[PDB]
């Protein structure tokens, strides 16, 4: 149990250090560990109140109990209240005060879900339809606007649209931001499925696979629709390869742009919300790689500060040059590209590459999934496998300088 001891000691050191580095930390302990997390774009800022309410979409990984898709609501103090003449400290010498003006995370809506929620991604066009990936072959599609806040006491679940077409479970799922209703899933059966929910009749409940993919030679880890294009989506699998797909092509097993990505098995990818040519792919070799869709032959860079596998690489909805990588290392590095190839002193370079901008050491166990807040800047909700959901944000002195 020495590993647990050193992990707890490092977490205590990080908690003591967190006033210096962070600007809003809200550690929360979920009832069950969540295998997914994702902010919702709707932010409520009621008049006469100094706190704004956001919303998350967290799954639940339960050993025996029923797994409920949790839609939590966080509360964060407003920017207007972020600088107020409240009080002062005689000994601390900082105009702080603990008090009771604090955030709060409350679970709003829970929906019964068969098996664990591997990945719960909401449809961006309608941020009410939610698609989850089950340990079974099928993919459920929920809609919390049409479901009660309190889950049905019976263990049976009633998904709004059960999507079939696979033979196993795969954590990789991604909606199509431009085409309304299209869905993608990266099963472990070395197959990718594209589903057109917008064409489902009102009385339809089970929809087969509109399009199948077979080009990958191993279990597809994650896929993602292009943020700007329409019929372009990447796919990273255990075959240590990345293939950029196009749905307009008649061939379904033809890897339009097949390039070996990393020595180990690629694990995730995410396209830049601003640049139409840049995607960042994780790896099991602890090497986040930048790619340019103009030329897939050579990686733009090979970000190397992790010591273990990298599970989820997410870009920033506020900056086109800010990354974020996480994995089994319990370390959510927040990379950036503005410091690419910057000369640094050895004392300041021993910490890591200049591309690294922040390290989140406040997770005792592995980071499962995380997502940037689309409204607030730099606010990240990262859920770990030890029933911890942190909503953190680094201080203004690390990025603004």
């Amino acid at each position: 149990a020495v590993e647990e001891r050193v992990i707890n000691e490092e977490y205590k050191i990080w908690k003591k250090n967190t006033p210096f580095l962070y600007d809003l930390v809200m550690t929360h302990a979920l009832e069950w560990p969540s295998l997914t997390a994702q902010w919702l774009p709707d932010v409520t800022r009621p008049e006469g109140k100094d706190f704004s309410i956001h919303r998350l979409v967290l799954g639940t990984h339960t050993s025996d109990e029923q797994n409920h898709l949790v839609i939590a609501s966080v509360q964060l103090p407003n920017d207007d209240a972020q600088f107020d003449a409240s009080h002062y400290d005689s000994e601390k010498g900082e105009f702080g005060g603990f008090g009771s003006v604090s955030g709060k995370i409350e679970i709003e809506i829970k929906i019964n879900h068969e098996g664990e929620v591997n990945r719960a991604r909401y449809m961006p066009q309608n941020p009410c339809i939610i698609a989850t990936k089950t340990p079974s072959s099928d993919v459920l599609v929920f809609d919390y606007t049409k479901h009660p806040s309190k889950p049905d006491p019976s263990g049976e679940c009633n998904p709004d649209l059960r999507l079939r077409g696979h033979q196993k479970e795969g954590y990789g799922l991604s909606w199509n931001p431009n085409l309304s209703g299209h869905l993608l899933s990266a099963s472990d059966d070395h197959t990718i499925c594209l589903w057109d929910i917008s064409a489902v009749p009102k009385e339809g409940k089970v929809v087969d696979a509109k399009t199948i993919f077979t080009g990958h030679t191993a279990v597809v880890e994650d896929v993602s629709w292009h943020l700007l294009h329409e019929s372009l989506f990447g796919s990273v699998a255990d075959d240590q390869k990345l293939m950029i797909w196009d749905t307009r092509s008649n061939n379904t097993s033809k890897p339009s742009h097949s390039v070996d990505a990393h020595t180990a098995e690629v694990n995730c990818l995410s396209f830049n919300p601003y640049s139409e040519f840049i995607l960042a792919t994780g790896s099991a070799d602890k090497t986040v790689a930048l790619w340019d869709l103009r030329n897939l032959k050579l990686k733009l860079h090979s970000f190397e500060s992790h010591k273990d596998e990298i599970f989820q690489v997410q870009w920033s909805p506020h900056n086109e040059t800010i990354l974020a990588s996480s994995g089994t290392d319990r370390r959510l590095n927040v990379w950036d590209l503005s410091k690419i190839g910057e000369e640094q002193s050895p004392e300041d370079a021993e910490d890591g590459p200049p591309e690294l901008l922040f390290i989140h050491g406040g997770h005792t166990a592995k980071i499962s999934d995380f997502s940037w807040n689309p409204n607030e800047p730099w606010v990240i909700c990262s859920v770990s496998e030890d029933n911890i959901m942190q909503v953190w944000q680094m201080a203004e002195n690390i990025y603004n300088d």
Partner: protein, 213 residues
């Protein structure tokens, strides 16, 4: 309800065609990292000593500590504690011994009002008030019976009806919740001038003086 924008860049009709053309050329002439240092990276916005010298207030809320959630400005400057290495140790600036354990060694039965209780619980009941009149019209009738001051009964009834209507209107206005009252300033108009705006002249002539004979 404020929704974050789905697109953070202007919709270029030729963007898809240009991307499709570049996807087939596969030319390595373009380097993105080279152009990054030569231009400002794209960004998007959100969807006692003076404050400006203190910085904006930090929230540090933790679930596992009994101490409440720190919400206040932090201004201590320590060069050793770098963001690239959070677990750096900076002695003589923050003693690395626990503080929350000192804050609350509670061991009390404190009704556990943090969450899940105190709000869901509720009750209901009914009551009738006849001997004791806690009503605006009933109270007015009781005070009129107690003292009349030789007042007119129809006038009293009209006053009671107007008071009830005013109470209803005030209750309706209470439903508007916060309502910012924009100041109304009207310039020093005069009847001598003829170039004044008709709006102000009318909104002030509405307050004329009704002379009595």
């Amino acid at each position: 309800m404020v929704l974050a924008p789905r697109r953070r860049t202007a919709f270029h009709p030729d963007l898809c065609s240009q991307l499709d053309q570049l996807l087939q050329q596969q030319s390595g002439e373009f380097s993105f990292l080279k152009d990054l240092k030569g231009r400002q990276p794209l960004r998007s916005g959100p969807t006692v000593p003076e404050r400006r010298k203190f910085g904006r207030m930090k929230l540090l809320q933790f679930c596992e500590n009994h101490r409440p959630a720190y919400w206040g400005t932090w201004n201590k400057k320590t060069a050793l504690i770098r963001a690239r290495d959070p677990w750096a140790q900076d002695t003589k600036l923050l003693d690395y011994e626990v503080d929350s354990d000192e804050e609350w060694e509670e061991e009390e039965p404190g009704e556990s009002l943090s969450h899940s209780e105190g709000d869901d619980d509720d009750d209901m009941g009914e009551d009738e008030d006849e001997d004791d009149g806690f009503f605006v019209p009933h109270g007015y009738l009781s005070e009129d019976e107690g003292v009349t001051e030789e007042c007119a009964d129809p006038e009293n009834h009209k006053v009671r009806q107007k008071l009830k209507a005013k109470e209803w209107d005030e209750f309706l206005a209470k439903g508007k919740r916060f309502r910012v009252l924009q100041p109304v300033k009207i310039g020093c108009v005069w009847a001598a001038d003829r170039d004044c705006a008709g709006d102000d002249l009318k909104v002030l002539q509405q307050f004329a003086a009704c002379f009595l004979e």
